[PDB]
Each structure stands twice: as C-alpha cells, then as structure tokens.
CSV table of C-alpha atoms and ligand atoms in Angstrom, one decimal:
chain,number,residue,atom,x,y,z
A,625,UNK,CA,-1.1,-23.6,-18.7
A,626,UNK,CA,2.0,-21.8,-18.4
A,627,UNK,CA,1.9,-18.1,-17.8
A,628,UNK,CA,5.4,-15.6,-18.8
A,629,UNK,CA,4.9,-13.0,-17.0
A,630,UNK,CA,7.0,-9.7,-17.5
A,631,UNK,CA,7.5,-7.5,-14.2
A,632,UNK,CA,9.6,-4.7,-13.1
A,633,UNK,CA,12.7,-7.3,-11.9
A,634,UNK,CA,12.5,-9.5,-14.7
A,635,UNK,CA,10.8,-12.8,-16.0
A,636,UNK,CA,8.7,-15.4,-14.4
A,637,UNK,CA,7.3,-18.3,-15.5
A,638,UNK,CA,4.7,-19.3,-13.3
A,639,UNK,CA,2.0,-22.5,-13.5
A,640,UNK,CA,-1.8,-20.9,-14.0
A,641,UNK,CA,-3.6,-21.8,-10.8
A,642,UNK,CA,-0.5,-22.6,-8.9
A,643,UNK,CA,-0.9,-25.0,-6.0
A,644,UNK,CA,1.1,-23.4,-3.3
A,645,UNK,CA,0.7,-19.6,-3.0
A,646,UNK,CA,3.3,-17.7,-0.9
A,647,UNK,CA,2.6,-13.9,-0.4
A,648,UNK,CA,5.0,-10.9,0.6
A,649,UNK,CA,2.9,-7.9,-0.5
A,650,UNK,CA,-0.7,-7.6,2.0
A,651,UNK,CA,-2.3,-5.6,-1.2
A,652,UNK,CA,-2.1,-9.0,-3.3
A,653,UNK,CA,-3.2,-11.1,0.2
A,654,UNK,CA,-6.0,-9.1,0.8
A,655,UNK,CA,-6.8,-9.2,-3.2
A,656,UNK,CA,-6.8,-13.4,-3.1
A,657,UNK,CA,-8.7,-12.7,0.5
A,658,UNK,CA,-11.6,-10.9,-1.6
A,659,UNK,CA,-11.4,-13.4,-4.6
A,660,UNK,CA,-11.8,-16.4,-2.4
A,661,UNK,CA,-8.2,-17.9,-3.3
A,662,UNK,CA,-6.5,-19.9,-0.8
A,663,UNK,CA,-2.9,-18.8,0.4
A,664,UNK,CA,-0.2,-21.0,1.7
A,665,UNK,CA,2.3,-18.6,3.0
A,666,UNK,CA,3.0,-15.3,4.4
A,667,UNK,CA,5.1,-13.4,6.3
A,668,UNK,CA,3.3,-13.2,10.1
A,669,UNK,CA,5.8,-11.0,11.8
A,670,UNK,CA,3.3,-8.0,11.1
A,671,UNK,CA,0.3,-8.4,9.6
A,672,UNK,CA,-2.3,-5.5,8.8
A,673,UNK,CA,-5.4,-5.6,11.2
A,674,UNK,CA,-8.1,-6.1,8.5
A,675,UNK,CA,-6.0,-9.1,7.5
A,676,UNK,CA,-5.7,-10.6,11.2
A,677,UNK,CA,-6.9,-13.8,9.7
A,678,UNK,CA,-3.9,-14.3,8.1
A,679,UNK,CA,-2.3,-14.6,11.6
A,680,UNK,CA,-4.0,-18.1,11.8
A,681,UNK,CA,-1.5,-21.1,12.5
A,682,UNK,CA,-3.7,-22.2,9.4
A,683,UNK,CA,-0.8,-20.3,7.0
A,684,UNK,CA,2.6,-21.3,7.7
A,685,UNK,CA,5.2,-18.1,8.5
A,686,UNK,CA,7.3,-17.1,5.9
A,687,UNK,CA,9.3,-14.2,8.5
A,688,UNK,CA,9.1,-10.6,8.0
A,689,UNK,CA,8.5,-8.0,5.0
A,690,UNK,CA,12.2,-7.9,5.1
A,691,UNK,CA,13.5,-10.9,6.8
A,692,UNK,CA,12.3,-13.9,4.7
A,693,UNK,CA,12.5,-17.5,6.2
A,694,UNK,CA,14.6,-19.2,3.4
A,695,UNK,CA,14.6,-22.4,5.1
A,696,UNK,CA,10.6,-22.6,5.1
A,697,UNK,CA,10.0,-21.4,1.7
A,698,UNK,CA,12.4,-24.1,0.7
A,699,UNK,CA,10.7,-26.5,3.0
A,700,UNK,CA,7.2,-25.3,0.7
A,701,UNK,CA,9.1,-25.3,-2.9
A,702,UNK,CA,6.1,-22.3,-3.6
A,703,UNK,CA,4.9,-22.2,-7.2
A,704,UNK,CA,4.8,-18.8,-6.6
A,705,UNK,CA,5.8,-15.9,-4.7
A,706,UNK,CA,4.3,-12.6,-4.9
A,707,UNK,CA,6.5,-9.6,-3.5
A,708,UNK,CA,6.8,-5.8,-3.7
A,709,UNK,CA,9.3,-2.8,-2.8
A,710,UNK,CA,10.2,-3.9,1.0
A,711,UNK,CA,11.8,-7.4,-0.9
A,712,UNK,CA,13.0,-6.2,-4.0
A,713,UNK,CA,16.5,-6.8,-3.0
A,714,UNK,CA,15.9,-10.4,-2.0
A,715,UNK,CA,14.4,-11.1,-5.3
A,716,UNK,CA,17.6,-12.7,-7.0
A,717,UNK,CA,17.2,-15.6,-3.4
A,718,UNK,CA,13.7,-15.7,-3.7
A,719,UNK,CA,13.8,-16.6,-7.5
A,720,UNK,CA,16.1,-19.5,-6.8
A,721,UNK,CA,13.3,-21.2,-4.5
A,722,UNK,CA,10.1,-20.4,-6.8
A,723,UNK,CA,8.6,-18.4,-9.3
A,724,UNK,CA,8.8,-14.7,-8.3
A,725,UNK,CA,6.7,-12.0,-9.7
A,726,UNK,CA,7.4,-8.6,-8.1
A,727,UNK,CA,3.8,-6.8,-8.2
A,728,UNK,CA,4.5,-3.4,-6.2
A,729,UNK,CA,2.4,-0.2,-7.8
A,730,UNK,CA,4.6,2.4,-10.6
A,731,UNK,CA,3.2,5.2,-8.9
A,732,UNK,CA,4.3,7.4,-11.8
A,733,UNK,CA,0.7,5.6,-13.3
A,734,UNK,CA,-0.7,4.7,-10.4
A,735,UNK,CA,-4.3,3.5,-11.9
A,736,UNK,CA,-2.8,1.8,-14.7
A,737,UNK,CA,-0.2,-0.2,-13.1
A,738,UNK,CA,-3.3,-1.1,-10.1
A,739,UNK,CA,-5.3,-2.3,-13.0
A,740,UNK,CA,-2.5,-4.3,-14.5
A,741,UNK,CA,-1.2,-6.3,-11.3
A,742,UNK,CA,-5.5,-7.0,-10.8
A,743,UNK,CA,-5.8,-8.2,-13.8
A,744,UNK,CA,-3.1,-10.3,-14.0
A,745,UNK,CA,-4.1,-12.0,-10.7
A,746,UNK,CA,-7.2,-12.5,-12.5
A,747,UNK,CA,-5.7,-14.5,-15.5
A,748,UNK,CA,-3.3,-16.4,-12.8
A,749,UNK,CA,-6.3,-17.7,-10.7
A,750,UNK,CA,-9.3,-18.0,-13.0
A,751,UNK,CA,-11.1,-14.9,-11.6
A,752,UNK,CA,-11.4,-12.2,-14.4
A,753,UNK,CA,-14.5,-11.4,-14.1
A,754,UNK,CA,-14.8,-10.6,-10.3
A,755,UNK,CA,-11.2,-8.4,-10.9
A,756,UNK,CA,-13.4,-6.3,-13.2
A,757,UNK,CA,-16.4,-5.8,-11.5
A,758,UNK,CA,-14.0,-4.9,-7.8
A,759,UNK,CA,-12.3,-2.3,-10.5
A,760,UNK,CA,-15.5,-0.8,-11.7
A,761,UNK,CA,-16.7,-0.4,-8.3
A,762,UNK,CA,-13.5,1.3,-7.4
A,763,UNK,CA,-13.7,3.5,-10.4
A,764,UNK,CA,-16.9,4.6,-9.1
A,765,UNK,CA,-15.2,5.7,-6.0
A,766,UNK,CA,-12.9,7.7,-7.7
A,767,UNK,CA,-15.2,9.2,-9.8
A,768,UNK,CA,-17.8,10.4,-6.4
A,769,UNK,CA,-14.4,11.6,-4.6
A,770,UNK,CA,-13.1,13.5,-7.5
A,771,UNK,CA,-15.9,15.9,-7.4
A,772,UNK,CA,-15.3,15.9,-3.3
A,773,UNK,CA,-11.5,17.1,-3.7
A,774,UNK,CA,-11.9,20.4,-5.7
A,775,UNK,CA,-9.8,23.5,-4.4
A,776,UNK,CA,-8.7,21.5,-1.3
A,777,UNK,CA,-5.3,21.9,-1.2
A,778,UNK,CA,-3.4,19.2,1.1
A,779,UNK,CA,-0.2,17.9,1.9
A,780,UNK,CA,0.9,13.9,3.1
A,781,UNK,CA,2.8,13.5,6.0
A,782,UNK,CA,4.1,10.6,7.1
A,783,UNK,CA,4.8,10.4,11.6
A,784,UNK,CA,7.9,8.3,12.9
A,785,UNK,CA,10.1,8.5,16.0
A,786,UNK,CA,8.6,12.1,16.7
A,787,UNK,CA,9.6,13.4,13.4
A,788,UNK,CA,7.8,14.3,10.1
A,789,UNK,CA,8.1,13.8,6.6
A,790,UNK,CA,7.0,14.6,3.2
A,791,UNK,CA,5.2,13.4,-0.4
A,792,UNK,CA,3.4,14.7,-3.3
A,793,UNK,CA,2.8,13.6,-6.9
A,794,UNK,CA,3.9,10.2,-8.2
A,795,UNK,CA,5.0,9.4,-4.4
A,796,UNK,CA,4.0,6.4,-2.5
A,797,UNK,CA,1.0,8.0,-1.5
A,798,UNK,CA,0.6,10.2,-4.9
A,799,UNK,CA,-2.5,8.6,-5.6
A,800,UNK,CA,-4.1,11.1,-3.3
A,801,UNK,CA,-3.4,14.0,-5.5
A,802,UNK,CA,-2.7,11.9,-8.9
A,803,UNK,CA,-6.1,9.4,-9.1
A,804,UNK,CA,-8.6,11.0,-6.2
A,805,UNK,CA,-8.1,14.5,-7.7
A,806,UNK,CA,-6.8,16.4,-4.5
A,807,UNK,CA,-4.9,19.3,-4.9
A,808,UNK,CA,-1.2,19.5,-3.8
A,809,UNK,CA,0.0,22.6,-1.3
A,810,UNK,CA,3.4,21.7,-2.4
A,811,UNK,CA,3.5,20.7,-6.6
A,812,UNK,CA,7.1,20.7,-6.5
A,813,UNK,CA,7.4,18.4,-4.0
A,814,UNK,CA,9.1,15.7,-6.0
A,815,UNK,CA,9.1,11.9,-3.8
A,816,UNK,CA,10.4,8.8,-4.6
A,817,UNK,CA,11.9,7.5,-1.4
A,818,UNK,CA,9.8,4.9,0.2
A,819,UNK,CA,9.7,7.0,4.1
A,820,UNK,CA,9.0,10.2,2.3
A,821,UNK,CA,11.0,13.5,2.3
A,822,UNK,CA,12.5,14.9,5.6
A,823,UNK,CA,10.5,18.4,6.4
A,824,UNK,CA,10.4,20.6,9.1
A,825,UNK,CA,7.0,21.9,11.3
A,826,UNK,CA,8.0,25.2,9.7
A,827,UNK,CA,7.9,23.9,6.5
A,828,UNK,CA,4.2,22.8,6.9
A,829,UNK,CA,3.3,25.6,8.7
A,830,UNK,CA,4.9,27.8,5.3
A,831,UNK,CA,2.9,25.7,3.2
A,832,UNK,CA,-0.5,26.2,5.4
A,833,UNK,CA,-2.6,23.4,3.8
A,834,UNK,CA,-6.7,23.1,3.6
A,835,UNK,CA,-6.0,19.6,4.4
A,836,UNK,CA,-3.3,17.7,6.5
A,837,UNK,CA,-3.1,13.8,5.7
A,838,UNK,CA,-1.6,11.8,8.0
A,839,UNK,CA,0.0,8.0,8.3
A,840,UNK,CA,1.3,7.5,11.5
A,841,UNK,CA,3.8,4.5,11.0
A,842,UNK,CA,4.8,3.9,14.3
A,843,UNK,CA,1.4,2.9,15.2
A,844,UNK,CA,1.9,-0.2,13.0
A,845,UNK,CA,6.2,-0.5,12.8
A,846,UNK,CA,6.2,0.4,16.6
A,847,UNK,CA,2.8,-0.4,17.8
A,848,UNK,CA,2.3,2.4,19.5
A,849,UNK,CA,0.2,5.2,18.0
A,850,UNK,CA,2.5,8.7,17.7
A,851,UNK,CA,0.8,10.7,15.0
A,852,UNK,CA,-1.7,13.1,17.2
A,853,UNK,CA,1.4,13.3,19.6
A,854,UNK,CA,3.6,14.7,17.0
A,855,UNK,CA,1.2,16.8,14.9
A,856,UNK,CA,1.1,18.6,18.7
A,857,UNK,CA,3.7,21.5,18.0
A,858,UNK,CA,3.0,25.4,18.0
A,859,UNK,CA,3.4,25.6,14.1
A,860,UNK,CA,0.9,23.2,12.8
A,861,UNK,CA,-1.2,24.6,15.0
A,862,UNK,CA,-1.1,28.0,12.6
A,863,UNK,CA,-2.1,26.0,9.8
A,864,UNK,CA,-5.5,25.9,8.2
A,865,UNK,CA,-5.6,22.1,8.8
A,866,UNK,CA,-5.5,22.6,12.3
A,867,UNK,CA,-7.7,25.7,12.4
A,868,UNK,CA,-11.0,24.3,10.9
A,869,UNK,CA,-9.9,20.7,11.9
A,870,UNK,CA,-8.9,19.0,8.9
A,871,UNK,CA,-6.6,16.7,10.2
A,872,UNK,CA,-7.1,13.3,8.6
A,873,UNK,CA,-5.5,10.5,10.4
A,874,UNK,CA,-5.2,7.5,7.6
A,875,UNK,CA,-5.3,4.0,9.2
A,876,UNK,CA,-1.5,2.6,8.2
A,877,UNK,CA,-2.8,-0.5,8.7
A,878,UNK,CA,-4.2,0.0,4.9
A,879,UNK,CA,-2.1,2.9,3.7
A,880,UNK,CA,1.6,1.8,5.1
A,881,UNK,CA,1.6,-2.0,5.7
A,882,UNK,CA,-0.5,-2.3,2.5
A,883,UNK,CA,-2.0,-1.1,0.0
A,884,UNK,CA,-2.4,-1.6,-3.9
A,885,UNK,CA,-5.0,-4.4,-3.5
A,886,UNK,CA,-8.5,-4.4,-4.6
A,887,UNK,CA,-9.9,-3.9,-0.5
A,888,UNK,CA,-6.4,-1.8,0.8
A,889,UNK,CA,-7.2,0.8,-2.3
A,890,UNK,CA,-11.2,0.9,-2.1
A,891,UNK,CA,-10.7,1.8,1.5
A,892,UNK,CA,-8.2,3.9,0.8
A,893,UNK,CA,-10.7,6.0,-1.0
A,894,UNK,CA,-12.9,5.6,1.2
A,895,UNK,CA,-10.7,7.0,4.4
A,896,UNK,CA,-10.0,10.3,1.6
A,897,UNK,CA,-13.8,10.5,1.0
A,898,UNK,CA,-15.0,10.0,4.6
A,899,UNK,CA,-11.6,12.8,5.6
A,900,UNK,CA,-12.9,15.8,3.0
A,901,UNK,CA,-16.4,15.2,3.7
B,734,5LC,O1,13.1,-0.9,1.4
B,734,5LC,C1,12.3,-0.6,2.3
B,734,5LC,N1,12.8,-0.4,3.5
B,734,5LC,C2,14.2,-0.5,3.9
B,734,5LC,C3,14.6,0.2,5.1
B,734,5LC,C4,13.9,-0.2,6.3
B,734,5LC,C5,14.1,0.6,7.6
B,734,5LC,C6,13.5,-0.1,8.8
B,734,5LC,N2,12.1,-0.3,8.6
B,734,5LC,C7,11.3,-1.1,9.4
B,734,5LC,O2,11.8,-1.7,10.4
B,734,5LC,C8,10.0,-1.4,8.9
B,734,5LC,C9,9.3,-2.5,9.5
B,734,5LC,C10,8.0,-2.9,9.0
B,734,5LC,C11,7.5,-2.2,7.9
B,734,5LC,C12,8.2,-1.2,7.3
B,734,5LC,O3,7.8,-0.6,6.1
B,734,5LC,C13,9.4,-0.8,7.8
B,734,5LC,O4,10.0,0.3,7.1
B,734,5LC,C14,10.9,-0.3,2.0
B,734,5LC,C15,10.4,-0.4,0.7
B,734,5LC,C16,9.1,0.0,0.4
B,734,5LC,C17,8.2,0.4,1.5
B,734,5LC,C18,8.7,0.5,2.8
B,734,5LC,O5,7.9,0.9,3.9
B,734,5LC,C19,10.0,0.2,3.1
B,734,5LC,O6,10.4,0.2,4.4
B,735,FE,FE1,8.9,1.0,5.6
C-alpha cells in the first residue's frame, strides 16, 4: 500500500494508486494517457501536440518544464510528482511539497531503463499487464526496424537558432543507433549534454552520412519550424543524405518535448521505420 521507490535522485515513498497525480515528464503523461489513468497536474506552458488534450482547463497548470508553479503544487499537496532531466535541479523543492520520483531514461541502457520506469508505472497504478503487452508490441517494432537499418550509416542533428549540433551512442537520442540498430557515421562521437554537441556544416559534410536525422527544436521551443531552413547550406548539400534524399525530419513534438513513454517511443520507431523505408 506503500511503494519505496529507488530512482536516480534518491528515495520516494509514494501511496500505490495515489489520488492526485502531478506530471513533469510528457513520456510518463502520454504513458497514463494510454493506460487510461487520470492526471491532476501538468505543466501547460508547452505541451507536445499529440498530447493537446492535456491543454484542457480540465488539468490545473503546474508552469513550465523548467519554471514550476510552487504555489499551485502546494495549493494540490500532489501524492506524487513525476519529473525528468529539465527538473532535476528542482528536485530537492519539489520533494518538500510531495513524493517525487525522477523517471528520465539512462540512456547508457536505454531499453532497460524504458522497461523499468513502465513497469514501475504499472505496479504504481494497477496496470501491469497492459505495460507488458504496450512493451511486447514495441519490441516487435524494434525487432521489424532492426532488420530495416543494416549498413545505413546516419548521423543526429539537432536545428536551433540557425545552428547545428551533434549525438551518437548513449546520447539523448542514442537509441537510434543503440536499440533500432542504425549504424553511426561518427562512433566516436561521445554525447551526454542534453542540446547535443556543437558541429560545424563541414563537419557533416566530412562525415558524408547514408542518412541525416533531424529534430528541429525551434519548431517546438520557438514555434516556428527552422530545420529545412538550416539544413539549406552548400555543404550538406554534398552529402549522401542530401543526394538520394534521405533527410528525415523527426517530429520534436515526440523526440524533443518527450519521449520515453510507451506512445512517444513506439512512434519514435515508427518515424525511424517510416524515414529508412
Ligand atoms: O536542463 C535542461 N535545460 C537547461 C537549459 C535550458 C536552456 C533554455 N531552454 C529552453 O528555453 C527550453 C524550453 C522548452 C524546452 C526545452 O527543452 C528547452 O531547452 C534540459 C534537460 C534535459 C532536456 C532538455 O531539453 C533540457 O533543456
Ligand atoms: Fe531543452
């Protein structure tokens, strides 16, 4: 009836089927969304498209990913609070209002830290079976993409303010090369950073990818789409990416504002699929 559960920031002690459900992550909203479990509480400053729902007056506004309203989630006393990397520093102020449990990905094991945060939504809410049947469905994905991504060599970009940057393995977006089997144009390419490593057009034009995958995040930080604007520049143009069009835009409304949950990450796959072939 009480659950301890052990995360990456700590300890929390959190009520199974707890009452008032306040959400920071839109990987775990859009997990609850799919499981039928009713939220209280999210931040509506920015809220993925394929979550618009979430926008309704229904939920009451918690503030931004990184701009919390204290006042409200004390007005709410939450029994608990799901958040991820974007509030990791707040976790210490969020703690002192409710149970906290920080479920952001390890993408050093991508797939095993997925199947752990889904599982353990499943103990919290009653729903292990329906967690298990999204996963094997997922794991079917993988499996069909897998044999879709031999030999095609790509490299992640990520679009803001005109500029590009970089990630490979065990990055933010690893999962791409490290779960759906896609070769990396740059193995040493070694990311941790949340906004990904700074690179020049000359750097991707030296590394000359099969594939090109793109997040534009201005599209969803800015709302305005930049990511076509800025792949246009003489050197990608020299790349094989360009050449035989294999640009693949990613919709950041899944990749960037979310991901991790059990719809963000099977359409996740499916954007990768659908971009290869
Ligand atoms: O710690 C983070 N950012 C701190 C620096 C913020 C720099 C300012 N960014 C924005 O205004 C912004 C607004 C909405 C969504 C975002 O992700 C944003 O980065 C962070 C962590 C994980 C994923 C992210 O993506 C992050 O950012
Ligand atoms: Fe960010």
């Amino acid at each position: 009836e009480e659950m301890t559960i052990k995360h990456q920031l700590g300890e929390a002690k959190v009520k199974k089927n707890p009452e008032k459900v306040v959400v920071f992550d839109f990987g775990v909203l859009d997990t609850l969304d799919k499981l039928g479990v009713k939220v209280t509480a999210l931040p509506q400053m920015n809220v993925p498209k394929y979550l618009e729902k979430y926008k309704s007056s229904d939920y009451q506004n918690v503030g931004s990913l990184m701009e919390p309203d204290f006042e409200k989630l004390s007005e709410i006393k939450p029994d608990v609070i799901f958040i991820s990397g974007r509030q990791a520093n707040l976790y210490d102020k969020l703690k002192e209002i409710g149970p906290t449990v920080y479920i952001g990905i390890d993408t050093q094991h991508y797939w095993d830290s997925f199947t752990n945060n889904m599982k353990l939504i499943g103990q919290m809410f009653g729903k292990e079976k329906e967690v298990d049947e999204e996963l094997a469905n997922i794991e079917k994905q993988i499996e069909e993409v897998k044999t879709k991504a031999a030999d095609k060599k790509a490299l992640i970009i990520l679009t803001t303010g005109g500029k590009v940057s970089a990630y490979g393995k065990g990055s933010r977006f690893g999962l791409i090369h490290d779960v759906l089997g896609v070769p990396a144009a740059d193995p040493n390419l070694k990311v941790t950073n949340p906004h990904g490593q700074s690179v020049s057009f000359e750097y991707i034009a030296e590394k000359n990818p099969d594939y090109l995958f793109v997040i534009d995040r201005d599209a969803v930080v800015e709302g305005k789409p930049t990511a076509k604007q800025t792949i246009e520049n003489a050197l990608v143009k020299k790349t094989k990416a360009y050449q035989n069009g294999h640009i693949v835009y990613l919709d950041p409304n899944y990749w960037y504002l979310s991901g991790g949950g059990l719809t963000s990450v099977s359409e996740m796959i499916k954007q990768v699929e659908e971009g290869l072939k």
